[PDB]
């Protein structure tokens, strides 16, 4: 039962590859979460004098979201995550965003524990793809992100 | 779609679920509301009006006064008054502000600067900051927002 994709790395924004299977794309940290860092820095240049338009923060805020790597996983299993659906309450987010690489490490792991003894779980190639997600700088995906939004 | 932004201002600071400004939101034919369980949306946008409203879902640690109770807080909005593709803003503004006007007559009517640097003011007026942005030397946007941590540390406001 394994599908032949389940905990490969992707995008956010790439349907091609895996239209097909049931996999869901989850987002380590969660992409509410990456989205909050993202305006807490913005926030931050506004206060300090920058320029930088509504339409310029959302187009950011969504860069951020739609090209965050993601690992492809089934749907029960994403269920447990962390931060499925309404699971994502506001003090998770918050804690999420004010320091992504805990909550990447925290994320990943749960999701792992729980794809022990699944037959259609991929436990061993989730977790070197989840260990990259863990090792990627998130701060800096997130500083280029801003600093493209705002370069014109 | 007409708003007045001046009436706006008296909403700033109170919950997502205020019954006066769910009321005066569906009024306006709004009721996009913010939420979280799908993505981070915390910004009602209204392209052709001109407007962005902005909420926060961390008021407390933000250091934002929050009047009444909810979850989602009105943390300030967006007057943009310049876009090449359409969608401005051409209603009243408050303190007898116009499009028109130059940096120093805004700077006239506000009367109380705060930072100056090459594309924004900074202002501070009955409990709220004010930003007003140029391109070149256009009017460009006119930035409110309540009190934050941010802003106090920046020393805009106290």
């Keep these: 039962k394994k599908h032949k994709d389940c905990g490969k790395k992707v995008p956010y924004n790439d349907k091609k590859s895996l239209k097909g299977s049931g996999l869901e794309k989850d987002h380590t940290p969660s992409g509410a979460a990456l989205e909050l860092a993202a305006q807490n820095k913005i926030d931050e240049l506004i206060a300090n004098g920058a320029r930088i338009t509504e339409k310029q923060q959302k187009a950011i805020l969504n860069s951020v979201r739609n090209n965050a790597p993601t690992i492809a996983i089934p749907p029960d299993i994403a269920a447990l995550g962390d931060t499925w659906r309404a699971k994502n309450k506001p003090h998770v987010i918050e804690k999420d965003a004010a320091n992504l690489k805990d909550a990447v490490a925290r994320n990943t792991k749960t999701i792992s524990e729980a794809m022990k003894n699944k037959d259609h779980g991929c436990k061993e190639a989730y977790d070197k793809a989840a260990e990259e997600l863990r090792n990627m700088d998130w701060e800096k995906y997130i500083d280029e992100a801003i600093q493209v939004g705002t370069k014109a | ?158």
């Design chain 2, 1 to 158: 779609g007409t708003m007045n932004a001046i009436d706006l201002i008296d909403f700033l600071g109170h919950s997502s679920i205020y019954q006066p400004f769910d009321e005066f939101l569906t009024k306006n034919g709004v009721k996009k509301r913010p939420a979280v369980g799908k993505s981070l949306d915390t910004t009602i946008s209204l392209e052709k009006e001109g407007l962005t409203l902005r909420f926060t879902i961390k008021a407390e640690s933000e250091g934002v006064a929050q009047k009444s109770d909810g979850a989602f807080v009105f943390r300030g909005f967006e007057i943009l008054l310049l876009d090449e593709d359409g969608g401005v803003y051409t209603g009243p503004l408050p303190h007898n502000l116009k499009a028109s006007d130059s940096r120093a007559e805004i700077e006239g009517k506000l009367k109380n600067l705060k930072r100056r640097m090459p594309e924004t003011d900074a202002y501070y007026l009955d409990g709220l900051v004010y930003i007003a942005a140029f391109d070149e030397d256009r009017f460009q946007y006119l930035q409110l927002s309540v009190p934050t941590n941010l802003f106090r540390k920046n020393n805009i406001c106290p």
